[PDB]
């Protein structure tokens, strides 16, 4: 439906090596510690340097 839908041209060339998320070139790390579907969060981003 996006990215690799009808057309594989929606991405870098992933097909290959096993359908891993590389959203904007960043690896996505799964965490099965989020609560059920409600008013809760599902996608969290963190930037650190110090």
- Contact positions toward a second copy, by CB under 8 A? 1-12, 15-16, 18-19, 24-25, 30, 32
Rg, the chain, Cα only:
14
Report, in Å, the least distance between residue 23 CB and a second copy: 10
Using the minimum distance from each CB to a second copy, give the nearer residue, 1 or 50: 1
Rounded distance between C-alpha atoms, residue 24 and residue 9, angstroms: 15
Using the minimum distance from each CB to a second copy, give the nearer residue, 31 or 39: 31
Rounded distance between C-alpha atoms, residue 43 and residue 34, angstroms: 10
Tell me if 12 sits within 8 A of 3, measured CB to CB: no
Using the minimum distance from each CB to a second copy, give the nearer residue, 6 or 46: 6
């Amino acid at each position: 439906e996006e990215w690799q839908d009808v057309a594989q041209v929606g991405n870098d060339s992933v097909k290959l090596q096993g359908q891993v998320g590389r959203i904007y070139g960043l690896p996505v790390v799964v965490s099965e510690y989020f609560p059920a579907k409600a008013n809760s969060a599902e996608f969290a981003v963190i930037v650190y340097k110090d």
